[PDB]
Design an enzyme around this catalytic site. Structure first.
Site, PDB file in Angstrom:
ATOM      1  N   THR B  91       0.818  -1.207   0.000  1.00 15.44           N
ATOM      2  CA  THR B  91       0.000   0.000   0.000  1.00 15.44           C
ATOM      3  C   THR B  91       0.855   1.262   0.000  1.00 15.44           C
ATOM      4  O   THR B  91       0.572   2.210  -0.742  1.00 15.44           O
ATOM      5  CB  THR B  91      -0.939  -0.009   1.201  1.00 15.44           C
ATOM      6  N   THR B  92       1.908   1.297   0.812  1.00 17.20           N
ATOM      7  CA  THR B  92       2.758   2.476   0.900  1.00 17.20           C
ATOM      8  C   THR B  92       3.837   2.505  -0.171  1.00 17.20           C
ATOM      9  O   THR B  92       4.640   3.440  -0.197  1.00 17.20           O
ATOM     10  CB  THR B  92       3.412   2.572   2.279  1.00 17.20           C
TER      11      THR B  92
END
Ligand SMILES: Nc1ncnc2c1ncn2[C@@H]1O[C@H](COP(=O)(O)OP(=O)(O)O)[C@@H](O)[C@H]1O
Ligand SMILES: Nc1ncnc2c1ncn2[C@@H]1O[C@H](COP(=O)(O)OP(=O)(O)O)[C@@H](O)[C@H]1O
Ligand SMILES: [Mg+2]
Ligand SMILES: [Mg+2]
Lengths: 49, 521, 529, 269
Positions: B91-92
């Site tokens: 996600t990051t």
């Protein structure tokens, strides 16, 4: 709730455990390195107990 | 002038300054989650308006907890939810990649380049990078049971190395792999019993081979019945076994006192008829969504039979696919094929709480996780970290293809695009070349979070790749580069394919916008 | 100092807050200014090189769209003269569906060019009469320019190349993949009678991987789970019901009356045994799947699981009716077993997970169905809505090709050729109207000007080059886009064609909205509230 | 399943009716744009009794908003949850009654009411089967009471076998906010006696003592006003007569009698 005795002994040790890390941070030591060396010591003390 | 077109308050902007001010707005979202990447990442602390603290290291929940109101920046928060819905990890890594594709093309916008040329270049590079990953994705022949267990242990150990539970990643990676093979085809996420019990130590977490739910409300006499059985017969019911009116819409019109007494005996005979039918079937444990009255509790105490009531729906359904019964709304048919069975049942105490266990099911197709921590936020961060290894292994069964990590796959892609850009002429050189220079943000953040020299290391990685070491990543313990494929740092090929498509679509959308209009209220 | 008083008459009898704008310098010249500002806002989104627009309404909802009509819908307008131009564009969306920006560009150029004529002496009535004469002439020249009509509307290789122009005008770059999805879905639901319906194409949006992962599916899909325990049937007999799945109760207030102890014991057992026969009666007809539209009962659910039946609940009324056409069933208003004609036959009904969303699929193996759905996948909730509208433009183009199969060369090759023929006609008319007809022809240059300004080339050289080639006789020459220099290109060979009915209604509605604004002389506005 | 509709009239009726829709839209999770984003099954089994669904998932209410002044319509339109109403259900006038019960009943109420029955028909056409009507009005102002009294009379006539409930308001006990409040109230109660099924008063089928106090004070002021025949020419000149007001007080006295609570010459008999 887990044991019932020692509830004023944990906060004293945790508070004194954080104070001793204050000098290590000021010397240029990554906090994850401190939190990694602490767990190794807790495995030596428990196996000794 | 005396009559005006739009309302008084319609703010409007356009032009080159409108687009450059959007590139500088995504630099703030990417910098909020910049320092939570890698084994040496640090989590953040956010507070709501009420005072509840949410302490976490994952991009998806950090960006959900910020009240972002900027229309341009709200695209970066929407692609994060897309990544945690398709693959659940990385996600990051799509937030730094989306901002680096805009920073590298910021100077070209100011020079007067038509943004349509940029969008054609971005789409050409993505299709050439996604196809390179599938060409060099490592797979195995005849994945046997042993080699198909080691493969998922390595993948689940890597997704856990950057989280709060990083010292005990070996112990936890053995429980997650065993928790997904119990499922059969659909791998439903509601067949895993994440439970949180305060007190204890992180090494005291257990995985059971059945179901376990908290003790519910009990009436008088609950302490007069046995709490350990050897081979019970679970009777999963949906009935109110309590003295009440037969129907809310009812009325009784009696004339004589002889018929008055027979009515009072009729309600006590309806209830006792249901209880006798259960007892004759040989059942020993009974469960029910609807409440169980005290009269039924004392009926089962005099016959050495356990009773329970007000069980949640999510817990009875988990019992059924662990024991093998069926929910009965009527007691008129309790055959041998509609009852459950197990090997042990007891009611122990864990952390000042009473829990019921149903271990010993050879045909069980569900599990349950008991998590032991020391604070409310210690268990939530452990549950969120376990939710990443669950979806990684779930995706790794449908696609047995893996690639190395730690920047090893970002650097092989940037080498392939730099070679391609030198052949095609025109303004595509400065756009594809700007795409290849933005893929090395992932290795740079790994050396910035640990506290390394981010420039000298990168000079060594760029030389090892141009010689021809394909899987040469970085190392944080050795202060150097190493082979990440032989170092057992593995991740499925589906976490990078979806990361480039989501990052390229978010960057191409922001560039095309010409002007914005905000209406009052 | 002194103060100028109010003139006696109507000015002294007006209510407070009201305004009065009368005359030619206060009403006509100000109405043109408001409408000229509206044309400069939506012009940037014209052609393949158009740009998106970020619009936020008063509910803090964000719109990233390129449609001309959608932009005007989410923008509030407080000018009465600019409000007729909006309602002129919304009428073409419901008749044709494509060509909303043409009205704004045309009605913006007819009005602005009329201001110059009003200062050289021409009256308002002479301008209105001149425009109408020119409007009729364009409706006679237009049929003579039709080329390359449609051949076969059931071939997947021909229809796909006819909708490409509509898609490429809204999603440049993805016009090859997107055109293969609409063409695959429109010909599947095309009946033998030829009566095309737009509501038979369904779009569902599931937040997922990317645009290239979208696919078509002959059937229906729902964002709901399964009520029972059975979650897969191979060859199902769907029995749709409109009444809720529970016991039948009277609408008048009724109650039981138990007067003996014996009737109290048998009441509970009577209701349960009554329900067993009703459920078993349906199960004997082979109905594996029961679809309801009301409230399911706890006792009724028990017997549904006993006989291996599938129970699905849809509380949306019209969504239930769409299922009856897909499987070929009939809604039963009463809880009675269907006989022979109220049993829908599907090919596969199962519950699956698509991008973390548990859905129910009524898949069909046959291509001849009544309703077909298109599954859209993307990475952002905004990106899927933008592609939702682009699909709708392609569907609406298929409906027009059903009515009228005639096509014209697009890309500006029609307006320039219409400018040459109208200009020559006005030369042969001696009088005060010849100035208005010439100005009508110059308004057709605003469309190629908008395509050249948005691309990034000098517009004046494009119209200069287009006029020379068309004079030789090449009426199929438009504007090149891929060329960096302002060159020209043939359009019939390239394959850029527009619908004849799309442009026929665009000119009629644009001229009507432009001649009504000129007729207004006095404006009496009330107090805003 | 016995779907019901609503009618809102007057300035007071619109203000309360606008807030009445607030408690239902939020309880059923109806978004301000008309969409639905609820997460319960109990909010959908009765969604059709109050809302009519549209194509694509739009849920519009079943209310009709009538008034003799156009200035009270845009307040609801621009307010919260004002976008979901049907654009065609707005019925407005241009003159206004001006606290005149009779002007809003025969001389000018006879034109706009024909514009309301055609609206209640198209709404009643879409419903499967309806069981009754809900109307909201006032009793002090002639703009709403006169128009409502005619409106409530032209609803019962076309639907003689349908129930109809009202949520009228009543005048203040001691103070009076209008000079002719007693005139506007007596002439309206007797028309609600045999034309309504259940009425409610907000401050033998009257709900909220035993309401006996409300009717006692109104007829005390009315009798004192009628003895001097004050401000009577405003009503008789537009089409009324003296006997019309006599039947109002004679009937008003009968209802008091149904609401029961439970000289110096006395020598021989
Ligand atoms: N043993 C390792 N050595 C070096 N880098 C690693 C190792 N394991 C994982 N990484 C890197 O750490 C990153 C993990 O980032 P993470 O915080 O999990 O992001 P997300 O939560 O979005 O998946 C991966 O990109 C991977 O390249
Ligand atoms: N490839 C192309 N080359 C040149 N012109 C094109 C091309 N594709 C579409 N056009 C033109 O763009 C014009 C405008 O399309 P668009 O702005 O999407 O909708 P509208 O017709 O409502 O303005 C059409 O009239 C069409 O002729
Ligand atoms: Mg991760
Ligand atoms: Mg178009």
């Amino acid at each position: 709730d887990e044991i019932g005795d020692g509830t004023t002994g944990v906060v004293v040790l945790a508070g004194a455990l954080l104070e001793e890390a204050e000098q290590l941070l000021d010397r240029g030591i990554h906090p994850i390195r401190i939190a990694d060396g602490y767990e190794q010591a807790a495995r030596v003390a428990i196996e000794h107990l | 002038t005396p009559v005006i077109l739009l309302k008084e308050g319609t703010d409007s902007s356009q032009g080159i300054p409108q687009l450059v001010s959007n590139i500088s707005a995504c630099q703030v979202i990417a910098e909020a989650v910049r320092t939570t990447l890698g084994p040496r990442g640090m989590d953040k602390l956010i507070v709501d308006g009420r005072g509840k603290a949410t302490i976490s290291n994952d991009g998806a929940t950090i960006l959900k907890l910020l009240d972002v109101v900027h229309p341009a920046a709200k695209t970066l928060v929407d692609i994060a939810k897309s990544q945690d819905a398709e693959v659940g990890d990385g996600t990051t890594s799509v937030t730094l990649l989306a901002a680096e594709f805009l920073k590298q093309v910021k100077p070209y916008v100011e020079e007067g380049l038509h943004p349509q040329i940029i969008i054609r270049a971005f789409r050409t590079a993505t299709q050439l990078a996604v196809n390179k990953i599938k060409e060099i994705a490592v797979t195995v022949k005849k994945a046997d049971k042993v080699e198909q267990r080691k493969l998922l242990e390595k993948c689940a150990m890597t997704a856990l190395s950057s989280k709060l539970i990083s010292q005990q990643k070996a112990f936890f990676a053995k429980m997650v792999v065993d928790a997904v093979m119990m499922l059969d085809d659909l791998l439903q996420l509601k067949m895993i019993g994440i439970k949180k019990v305060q007190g204890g130590a992180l090494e005291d977490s257990q995985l059971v081979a059945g179901v376990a739910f908290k003790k519910t409300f009990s009436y008088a006499g609950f302490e007069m019945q046995p709490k350990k059985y050897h081979n019970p017969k679970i009777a999963l019911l949906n009935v109110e076994l309590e003295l009440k009116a037969e129907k809310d819409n009812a009325e009784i019109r009696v004339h004589t006192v002889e018929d008055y007494q027979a009515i009072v005996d009729a309600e006590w005979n309806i209830l006792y008829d249901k209880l006798e039918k259960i007892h004759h079937s040989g059942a020993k444990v009974v469960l029910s969504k609807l409440p169980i009255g005290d009269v039924a509790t004392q009926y089962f105490a005099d016959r050495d039979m356990f009773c329970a009531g007000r069980v949640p729906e999510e817990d009875l359904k988990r019992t059924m696919m662990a024991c093998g019964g069926s929910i009965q709304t009527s007691v008129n048919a309790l055959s041998a094929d509609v009852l459950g069975r197990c090997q042990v049942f007891e009611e122990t105490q864990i952390g000042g709480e009473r829990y019921n266990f149903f271990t010993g099911c050879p045909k069980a197709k569900t599990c349950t996780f008991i998590l032991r921590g020391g604070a409310e936020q210690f268990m939530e961060e452990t549950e969120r970290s376990l939710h990443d290894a669950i979806m990684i292994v779930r995706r790794a069964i449908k696609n047995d293809s893996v690639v190395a990590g730690g920047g090893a796959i970002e650097m092989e892609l940037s080498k392939y695009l730099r070679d391609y850009s030198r052949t095609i002429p025109g303004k595509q050189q400065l756009l594809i070349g700007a795409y290849a220079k933005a893929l090395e943000i992932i290795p740079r953040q790994l050396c910035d979070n640990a506290g390394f020299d981010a420039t000298n290391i990168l000079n060594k990685l760029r030389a090892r790749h141009a010689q021809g070491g394909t899987w040469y990543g970085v190392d944080i313990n050795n202060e150097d580069i190493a082979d990440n494929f032989e170092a057992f740092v593995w991740e499925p090929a589906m976490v990078r394919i979806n990361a480039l498509t989501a990052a390229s679509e978010a960057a191409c959308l922001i560039v095309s916008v010409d002007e914005t209009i905000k209406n009052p209220r | 100092a002194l103060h100028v008083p109010k003139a006696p008459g109507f000015a002294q009898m007006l209510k407070e807050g009201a305004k009065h704008f009368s005359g030619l310098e206060e009403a006509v010249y100000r109405n043109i200014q408001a409408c000229k500002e509206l044309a400069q806002t939506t012009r940037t989104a014209y052609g393949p090189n158009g740009m998106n627009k970020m619009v936020i309404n008063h509910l803090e909802k964000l719109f990233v769209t390129n449609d001309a009509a959608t932009i005007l819908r989410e923008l509030e307008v407080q000018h009465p003269a600019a409000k007729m131009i909006v309602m002129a564009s919304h009428m073409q969306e419901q008749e044709v569906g494509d060509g909303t920006n043409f009205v704004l560009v045309f009605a913006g150029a007819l009005l602005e060019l009329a201001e110059e004529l009003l200062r050289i002496g021409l009256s308002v009535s002479e301008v209105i009469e001149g425009y109408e004469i020119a409007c009729r002439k364009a409706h006679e020249i237009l049929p003579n320019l039709v080329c390359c009509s449609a051949k076969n509307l059931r071939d997947i290789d021909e229809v796909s190349s006819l909708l490409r122009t509509s898609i490429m005008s809204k999603q440049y770059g993805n016009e090859v993949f997107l055109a293969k999805l609409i063409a695959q879905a429109c010909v599947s639901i095309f009946p033998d009678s030829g009566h095309f319906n737009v509501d038979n194409i369904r779009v569902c949006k599931i937040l997922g991987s990317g645009i290239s992962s979208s696919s078509v599916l002959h059937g229906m899909v729902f964002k709901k789970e399964t009520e029972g325990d059975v979650t897969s049937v191979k060859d199902a007999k769907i029995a749709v019901y409109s009444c809720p799945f529970d016991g039948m109760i009277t609408e008048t207030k009724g109650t039981v009356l138990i007067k003996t102890a014996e009737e109290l014991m048998n009441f509970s057992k009577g209701e349960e045994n009554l329900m067993d026969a009703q459920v078993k009666a349906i199960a004997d007809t082979g109905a594996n799947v029961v679809v309801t539209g009301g409230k399911v009962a706890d006792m009724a659910l028990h017997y549904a699981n006993k006989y291996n039946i599938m129970l699905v609940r849809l509380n949306s009324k019209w969504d239930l009716r769409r299922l009856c056409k897909t499987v070929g069933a009939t809604a039963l208003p009463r809880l009675t077993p269907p006989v022979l004609e109220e049993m829908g036959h599907c090919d596969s009904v199962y519950l699956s997970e698509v991008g973390d969303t548990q859905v129910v699929v009524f898949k069909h193996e046959k291509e001849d169905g009544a309703i077909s759905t298109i599954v859209l996948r993307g990475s952002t909730d905004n990106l899927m809505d933008d592609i939702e509208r682009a699909v709708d433009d392609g569907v609406n183009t298929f409906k027009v090709l059903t009515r009228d199969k005639r096509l014209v060369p697009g890309g500006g090759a029609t307006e320039i050729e219409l400018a040459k023929q109208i200009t020559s006609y006005g030369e042969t008319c001696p009088g005060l109207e010849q100035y208005a007809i010439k100005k009508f022809a110059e308004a057709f240059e605003a469309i190629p000007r908008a395509l050249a300004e948005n691309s990034g080339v000098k517009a004046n050289e494009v119209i200069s080059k287009l006029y020379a080639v068309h004079q030789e006789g090449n009426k199929n020459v438009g504007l090149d886009i891929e060329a960096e220099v302002p060159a020209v290109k043939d359009m019939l060979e390239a394959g850029i064609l527009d619908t004849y009915l799309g442009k026929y209604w665009a000119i009629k509605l644009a001229t009507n909205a432009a001649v009504t604004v000129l007729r207004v002389d006095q404006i009496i506005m009330a107090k805003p509230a | 399943m016995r779907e019901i509709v609503h009618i809102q009239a007057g300035q007071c009726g619109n203000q309360i009716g606008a807030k009445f829709w607030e408690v239902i839209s939020d309880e059923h999770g109806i978004d301000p744009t008309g969409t639905y984003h609820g997460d319960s099954d109990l909010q959908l089994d009765r969604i059709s009794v109050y809302y009519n669904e549209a194509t694509g998932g739009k849920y519009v209410p079943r209310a009709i908003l009538v008034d003799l002044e156009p200035g009270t319509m845009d307040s609801v339109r621009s307010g919260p949850f004002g976008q979901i109403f049907r654009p065609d259900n707005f019925v407005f006038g241009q003159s206004g009654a001006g606290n005149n019960w009779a002007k809003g009943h025969y001389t000018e109420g006879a034109e706009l009411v024909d514009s309301v029955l055609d609206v209640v028909r198209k709404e009643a056409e879409s419903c499967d089967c309806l069981q009754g009507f809900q109307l909201t009005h006032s009793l002090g102002g002639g703009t709403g009471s006169g128009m409502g009294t005619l409106l409530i009379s032209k609803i019962r006539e076309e639907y003689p076998d349908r129930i109809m409930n009202t949520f009228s308001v009543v005048p203040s006990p001691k103070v009076s906010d209008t000079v002719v409040e007693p005139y506007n109230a007596t002439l309206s109660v007797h028309q609600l006696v045999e034309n309504t099924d259940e009425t409610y008063c907000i401050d033998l089928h009257f709900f909220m003592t035993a309401i006996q106090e409300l009717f006692k004070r109104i007829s005390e002021q009315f009798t004192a006003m009628f003895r001097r025949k004050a401000f009577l020419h405003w009503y008789t000149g537009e089409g009324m007569d003296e006997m019309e007001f006599t039947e109002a007080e004679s009937n008003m006295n009968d209802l008091v009698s149904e609401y029961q609570q439970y000289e110096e010459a006395e020598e021989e008999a």
